[PDB]
């Protein structure tokens, strides 16, 4: 479901690293990654938002944020 690069189409799609938590246990990462140590590092950064999101997914709906 994720879109790890800008597509093979010349496709108009906001290219900005981010981590999505749509709900129902569906986690997607949207970024346009190039082969660089810069995007090797922000891949580790954006996966960290996902592993934080996968952990508190057993709480009720209104408590699924960070603690502050």
């Amino acid at each position: 479901n994720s879109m790890l690069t800008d597509p093979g189409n010349v496709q108009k799609a906001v290219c900005h690293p981010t981590a999505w938590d749509l709900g129902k246990g569906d986690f997607r990462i949207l970024m346009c990654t190039k082969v660089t140590m810069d995007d090797f590092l922000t891949a580790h950064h954006e996966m960290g938002h996902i592993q934080y999101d996968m952990a508190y997914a057993a709480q009720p709906f209104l408590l699924r944020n960070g603690a502050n």
């Binding site: 479901n1 129902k24 246990g25 569906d26 986690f27």
Partner: protein, 49 residues
């Protein structure tokens, strides 16, 4: 349930069948399947038909 195809596992539909065997009393019924072979001829043999 609003089921969607892009739903993480644990949110996708599972079909369930619960078999419940309940005994009671009778003279006989279903049971295991017996095995067999290929009977011969013209040879003292030990047979079960």
């Amino acid at each position: 349930y609003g089921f969607q195809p892009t739903n993480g596992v644990g949110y996708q539909p599972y079909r369930v069948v619960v078999l419940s065997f309940e005994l009671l009393h009778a003279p006989a019924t279903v049971c295991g399947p017996k095995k067999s072979t290929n009977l011969v001829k013209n040879k003292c043999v030990n047979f079960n038909f």
